[PDB]
Write a protein that holds these residues in place. Structure first.
Motif, PDB file in Angstrom:
ATOM      1  N   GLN A 245      12.788  -3.960 -11.720  1.00  0.00           N
ATOM      2  CA  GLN A 245      11.536  -3.210 -11.612  1.00  0.00           C
ATOM      3  C   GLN A 245      11.833  -1.752 -11.952  1.00  0.00           C
TER       4      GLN A 245
ATOM      5  N   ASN B  23      -0.480  -8.084  -9.667  1.00  0.00           N
ATOM      6  CA  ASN B  23      -0.116  -6.720 -10.014  1.00  0.00           C
ATOM      7  C   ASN B  23      -1.169  -5.786  -9.436  1.00  0.00           C
TER       8      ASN B  23
ATOM      9  N   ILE C 183       5.733  -7.895 -13.941  1.00  0.00           N
ATOM     10  CA  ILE C 183       4.783  -6.967 -13.357  1.00  0.00           C
ATOM     11  C   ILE C 183       5.434  -5.603 -13.173  1.00  0.00           C
TER      12      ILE C 183
HETATM   13 MG   LIG Z   1       5.026  -2.341 -11.358  1.00  0.00          MG
END
Ligand SMILES: [Mg+2]
Ligand SMILES: [Mg+2]
Lengths: 468, 407, 50, 105, 97, 97, 48, 40
Positions: free
Chosen positions: A181, A429, A468
RNA sequence: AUACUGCACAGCUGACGAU
DNA sequence: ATCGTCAGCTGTGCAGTA
DNA sequence: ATCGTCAGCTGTGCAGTA
């Protein structure tokens, strides 16, 4: 005159069978849909020494009730309840002392001399993935990873003066247990004079310190625990349906075009499953239109993945595609369907513009969900004014997405409009209410945006936690 | 007597005014002298378990303290204020007028805040009636607002739509053509007399609504007679390319025949308002009766401090399309601005000029723009007749009547 | 006689409420579940509590 | 929906009645048939002793065989036998939402 | 599907009163009074959601493709009868179909 | 309308329950087979019903043959697939023999 | 054991046989006297 | 009385006959709302 | 790069036809 | 084969959080 | 199994709701 309908706002399932239209409120009031067994989440972090320490104080300080932007309109920026004894996720999150990566400051100036930028993104991302692999090799595996980039390592990898970022590093990272991420320092540091790329401005103003922690944590919780935050509820009389959506992305340079896809359906217990597909999606053409082979392949794949879990076959198939529904592939779709035996069928097309731009009397724009049937093409307003908030979140010109169902579909356009309106805030998301483009095409865009440059080896993980 | 009976008929009439939009006013015994029965908010056959404390005064006949149709600068006492603040339920104030049977309410609570002397400014737009009823819904819900809220309280308001229906003419004219379009533009440009260009030529035939000997000469057309076809038999079998050719026909028809002939932009699309002279204002107030005439069309904006230099001049633009929505046409509008520095030379910085007012606040003029643009185009031959868009009906309304306006 | 027993039950409930000096006022039959409104006083202290 | 139109019709018919006096009680929810008890005002004092009144309210829409001059209503014989055996006169009214057509019979 | 939605719309519209044809010969065209308190039946009609048969477009496409006249009408009739029979056997029995 | 039903568990597959039992002929010594075909409704309901057929005797034995057992399961699956628009994932059979 | 008290003819918890066996036995009891060519119903209320 | 705690509602109220009386004793309570071895 | 909103701009696609 | 007409189809940057 | 005579009863479809 023209006929119209309105829709009440759909709810979202949560813990204790709880239904609510506000996912922040449902998470904070009844917990997640599937709670975790252990109260631990371990998060990796890559960054310089300044970002790790104030990241630790950020994690500590958000556990005491950071309030919203203001007392007025107390429901778009709600107070974050913290991470202690009243958490929306009912679990604790921390950085383990085995994932504390740092970056060398030696290979900069000759990168700053800039002979080539493609080789620069190659060596930087190779070093990043090498560190992540070395972290996952030991007995300090994290559930997720924060890939907070150094400023000079980013400013000179994005506007390096044709590069690409935020997804190519993932495209060479389908081999690690944790889905990464990337987080820019804009809220992690929340003080630095970040540039605005092309327009030489002050910074990108973001928001206050409630909604950022809210949706960031929500994404982190889904990506780390593997449990799912929310889903929409079934109805007492609903059949079994699968949602497939197709997007029409470009090449790595943009001469040929390929088609990406997504897949989602329900669960046997209390859950929701949203996957991509662990295969290539090559062109066999140049004009952006479907083929019989790709449509038949994706239909067979969604049917197989439903029968793998439920031990039955679905009674309904739903397809949302961004181009014309012609018989060159509809024959393959229909043939694959009665080869299976599914009875109810739907085939919906989007993106027809300049059709209707309905206004109202007053000052504000239209409400959220005023649907009109334009004699077959049903236009709906997925955005608009919004009564529980008391305000109007949005600037100007809300786009009324319309549904052009294919004539093979067995339903009325108003029923499908209600069903898609129930299928807006279901993607995992962020916690935003307004979502114009539906989830089956949203996830297809989200997988195609990383598939448009690498599919050569390193097959994808269709778990959606790295999307995401 | 007089006052007690007129007060009880006033509370009867405001009970009816409660009842006319749901809002079950359940009364009680009169043994408090300052609170009436408890109202319960309801939404179309479903009670919502929300209650408001009501209180009603006697009557109001004729003129009174600063009585007016809009101002009504009336001041109340201060002994009752604490009596109206020592409460949990939001007590609402009610008065009754026998002149037009109306009902006064413009206050609920201030949370121990002495705001002047309880000003009751009423009949500015509407009193306690069908309009502006969400001012009564958002009373027991405070600004803390954890999860509780109120949906819009029924109502039902009309709304306009932005496509103008079109009534096309009756005939259409075709002929044979053995020429080229590059010769056509040359003979149009170098010709002597006045000329129009409301025609198109396809690869095989002709496509227009004019004579064998047009006002714009007759060299491009053939010596043969043109054929008269009614417009109700036009391309209704196949081949949407014929619809494209009709689109180019109507495109040249709108381009070379309009009202107060304009220029045709290619930045946004289609047409835009011109300048009458060298950098002057352009209002053109017109209306379709009613009581309000047009406000502005084209203005001139100058520099903030450098008075000897002009900043820009903006005009209004839109772009019709072609949609045979169930054998009935519709011209579709998009109100936009177009910027220049003199009115003829195009602007090189027109990108951030479209924002600003598009960025500042709510629309607040889009209805007026739609109305004036639908009235602008409805005013030898014209070859066009325009209509009026339908007004659709909605079951729901925005609670901005009960909300707070943008400051 | 279900209306009869409902009405006498409501009246006796109101009587037991009011013999201690506690206000209770019923509503019409247009409701569903909210059978009345009670406000409390003790020795002449009727605050607007609902 | 039709349950609230009768209540608001009774309320505004009573408001018309209370307009010029005509002291009206209405009934409780225990009533059946006859509505509440009303009287007649005489310039500010109830000189009239008592009389009975019944409400009958309907929605928007014309009555049976109504053509610009009249209409017709039919009475159930159970109600007729109910009012015939009584000790007080009764009156019957009609709807109020087209143009407030309060009529007496 | 469309027949069912238009049937529900028809019931909802005609339950709220229907105007007469005109003032010419009023007894020939009296207005319908709807299923309110002025209903000329003293009962009301409702369409429960627990039993409602929607016909799929694949079967209608197969009906519209058979060239033989007899068995196509026969199979349409039999399918409708089977749907109504399974309607009757369950606990969602309607008063009238 | 049914008064009550058993609570279904969470996470279990879809299933239909078929009993089997036998009976005599009230004059002679023979045995038939007769049973019900219960399952769960799509909404909130329970379908308990028999079949519109009578099996033959075929000897004085409380065991059937391999010609009507297949037919019974075919009827159960058709009755399930007409209502749920799909085939079930489990079949439960209870017998007294 | 879960399919025990579903029998609607009674209200006791003292039930031994499960519901499908009881339903099959009652269906057979009523079906014993039905002649050939008659009409048989699938409705359960005609058997209890 | 029924509470307003977060989560689900509280059905199946159990009422005793000692402290739930509507006499003068309980007036102010609701005014504060503001194995075995066997053988075979 | 938390996302999801519009705006502005750019490139690309296919549907018809020529001196 | 680029020019016109018409319909998409897909990429990049600002702002303001009412 | 056909053809004129008279006397009457079911299918199948179109306007028009006066
Ligand atoms: Mg994100
Ligand atoms: Mg019995």
């Amino acid at each position: 005159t023209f006929e119209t309908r309105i829709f009440d706002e759909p709810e979202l399932e949560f813990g204790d069978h709880h239904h609510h239209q506000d996912p922040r409120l449902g998470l904070s009031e009844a917990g997640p849909l599937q709670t975790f067994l252990g109260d631990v989440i371990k998060i990796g972090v890559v960054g310089n020494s300044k970002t790790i320490e104030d990241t630790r104080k950020f994690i500590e300080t958000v556990s005491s009730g950071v309030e919203g932007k203001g007392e007025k309109h107390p429901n778009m920026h709600p107070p974050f309840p913290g991470l202690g004894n009243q958490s929306p996720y009912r679990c604790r999150f921390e950085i383990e002392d085995g994932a504390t990566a740092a970056l060398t400051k030696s290979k900069l100036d000759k990168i700053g001399k800039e002979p080539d930028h493609y080789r620069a993104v190659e060596m930087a991302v190779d070093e990043i993935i090498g560190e992540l692999q070395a972290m996952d090799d030991g007995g300090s595996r994290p559930d997720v990873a924060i890939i907070a980039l150094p400023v000079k390592l980013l400013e000179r990898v994005w506007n390096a003066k044709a590069p690409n970022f935020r997804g190519m590093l993932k495209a060479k990272a389908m081999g690690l247990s944790f889905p990464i991420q990337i987080v820019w320092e804009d809220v992690i540091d929340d003080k630095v004079t970040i540039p605005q790329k092309v327009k030489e401005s002050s910074s990108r103003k973001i928001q206050d310190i409630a909604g950022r922690t809210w949706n960031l944590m929500t994404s982190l919780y889904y990506k780390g625990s593997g449990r799912i935050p929310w889903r929409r509820m079934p109805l007492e009389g609903e059949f079994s349906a699968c949602y497939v959506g197709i997007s029409f992305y470009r090449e790595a340079d943009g001469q040929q075009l390929f088609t990406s896809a997504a897949q989602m359906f329900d669960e046997r217990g209390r859950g929701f499953v949203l996957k991509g597909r662990r295969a290539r999606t090559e062109s066999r053409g140049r004009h952006p239109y479907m083929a019989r082979e790709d449509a038949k392949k994706i239909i067979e794949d969604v049917l197989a993945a439903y029968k793998l879990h439920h031990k039955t076959l679905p009674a309904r198939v739903f397809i949302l595609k961004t181009s014309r529904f012609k018989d060159e592939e509809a024959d393959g779709i229909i043939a694959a369907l009665d080869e299976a035996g599914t009875e109810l069928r739907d085939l919906v097309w989007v993106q027809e513009s300049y059709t209707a731009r309905i206004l109202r009397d007053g000052n504000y724009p239209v409400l959220r969900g005023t649907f009109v049937d334009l004699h077959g093409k049903g236009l709906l307003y997925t955005s608009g004014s919004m009564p529980y908030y008391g305000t109007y979140p949005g600037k100007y010109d809300p786009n009324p997405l319309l549904l052009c169902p294919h004539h093979t579909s067995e339903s009325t356009v108003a029923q499908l409009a209600e069903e898609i309106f129930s299928l807006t805030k279901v993607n995992w998301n962020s916690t935003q209410m307004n979502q114009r483009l539906p989830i089956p095409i949203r996830a297809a865009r989200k997988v195609g945006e990383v598939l448009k440059y690498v599919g050569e080896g390193e097959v994808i993980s269709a778990d959606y936690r790295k999307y995401i | 007597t007089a006052n007690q009976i007129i007060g009880e008929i006033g509370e009867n009439e405001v009970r009816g005014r409660f009842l006319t939009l749901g809002w079950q006013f359940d009364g009680r015994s009169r043994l408090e002298a300052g609170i009436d029965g408890i109202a319960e908010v309801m939404n179309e056959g479903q009670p919502m378990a929300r209650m408001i404390a009501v209180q009603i005064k006697s009557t109001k006949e004729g003129k009174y303290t600063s009585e007016s149709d809009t101002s009504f600068t009336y001041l109340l006492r201060t002994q009752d204020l604490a009596y109206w603040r020592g409460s949990n339920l939001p007590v609402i104030v009610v008065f009754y007028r026998q002149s037009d049977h109306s009902f006064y309410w413009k206050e609920v609570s201030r949370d121990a805040g002495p705001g002047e002397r309880r000003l009751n400014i009423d009949k500015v737009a509407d009193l306690f009636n069908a309009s502006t009823v969400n001012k009564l819904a958002a009373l027991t819900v405070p600004k803390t607002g954890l999860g509780y809220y109120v949906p819009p309280l029924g109502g039902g308001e009309d709304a306009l739509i932005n496509m103008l229906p079109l009534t096309l003419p009756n005939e259409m004219y075709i002929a044979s053509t053995t020429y080229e379009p590059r010769k056509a533009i040359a003979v149009i440009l170098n010709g002597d007399g006045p000329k129009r260009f409301d025609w198109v030529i396809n690869g095989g035939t002709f496509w227009s609504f004019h004579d064998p000997r047009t006002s714009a000469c007759s060299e491009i057309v053939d010596i043969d007679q043109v054929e008269a076809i009614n417009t109700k038999e036009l391309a209704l079998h196949d081949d949407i390319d014929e619809q494209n050719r009709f689109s180019h026909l109507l495109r040249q028809t709108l381009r070379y025949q309009t009202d107060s002939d304009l220029g045709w932009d290619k930045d946004h699309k289609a047409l835009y308002f011109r300048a009458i002279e060298r950098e002057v204002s352009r209002n053109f107030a017109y209306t379709s009766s009613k009581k309000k005439t047009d406000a502005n069309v084209v203005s001139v904006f100058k520099n903030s401090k450098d008075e000897t230099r002009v900043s820009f001049v903006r005009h209004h633009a839109f772009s019709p399309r072609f949609e045979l929505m169930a054998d009935q046409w519709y011209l579709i509008i998009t109100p936009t601005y177009y910027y220049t520095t003199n009115g003829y030379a195009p602007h090189q910085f027109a990108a951030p000029l479209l924002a600003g007012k598009k960025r500042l606040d709510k629309s607040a003029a889009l209805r007026g723009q739609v109305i004036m643009w639908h009235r602008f185009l409805t005013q030898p031959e014209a070859y066009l007749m325009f209509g009026e868009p339908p007004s659709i009906h909605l079951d729901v309304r925005v609670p901005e009547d009960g909300w707070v306006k943008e400051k």
